[PDB]
């Protein structure tokens, strides 16, 4: 009988230990989820920006192609003015 309840004082302590640990596995399965959620949202955002960025990169490449054309047009135009001047020159010359 002193045997028994002395024995019980251990069972109850073990139950108390289990409750703590269990509430623990409660608080963590509720975090790991939070950590995962915050990953999801983060990865999603990275992709909107990623898609946003590719779109801006594509626009850039188009403008550069136009600038390269202009780069050629001004060169040709300049050249035309130089030829035009040579003639005016020759007109005054002997």
Which chain residues interact with Pt ion by CB under 5 A?
88
Q: Contact between 32 and a second copy (CB under 8 A)? A: yes
Q: Contact between 61 and a second copy (CB under 8 A)? A: no
Alpha helix stretches (DSSP H) within 1-94:
2-29, 32-92
**Please, what is the minimum distance in Å from the beta carbon of residue 26 to a second copy?**
10
DSSP 44: H
Long-range CB pairs of 6-11, under 8 A, 24+ apart, other chains included? none
Q: Residues 82, 85, 86, CA angle at the centre, nearest 5°?
A: 90
CA 84 to chain centre: 54
- Identify the residue among 1, 4, 9, 40 touching a second copy (CB under 8 A): 4
Q: Contact between 68 and Dy ion (CB under 5 A)? A: yes
Q: Contact between 18 and a second copy (CB under 8 A)? A: yes
Residues binding a second copy (CB under 8 A): 3-4, 7-8, 10-11, 14-15, 17-18, 21-22, 24-25, 28-29, 31-32, 35-36, 38-39, 42, 74, 81
């Amino acid at each position: 009988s002193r045997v028994i309840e002395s024995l019980h004082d251990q069972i109850d302590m073990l139950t108390k230990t289990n409750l703590q640990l269990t509430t623990q596995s409660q608080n963590l399965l509720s975090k790991l989820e939070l950590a995962q959620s915050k990953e999801s949202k983060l990865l999603e955002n990275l992709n909107l920006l990623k898609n946003e960025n590719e779109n801006l990169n594509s626009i850039f490449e188009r403008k550069n192609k136009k600038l390269k054309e202009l780069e050629k047009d001004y060169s040709e135009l300049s050249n035309r003015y130089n030829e035009q001047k040579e003639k005016m020159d020759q007109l005054s010359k002997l």
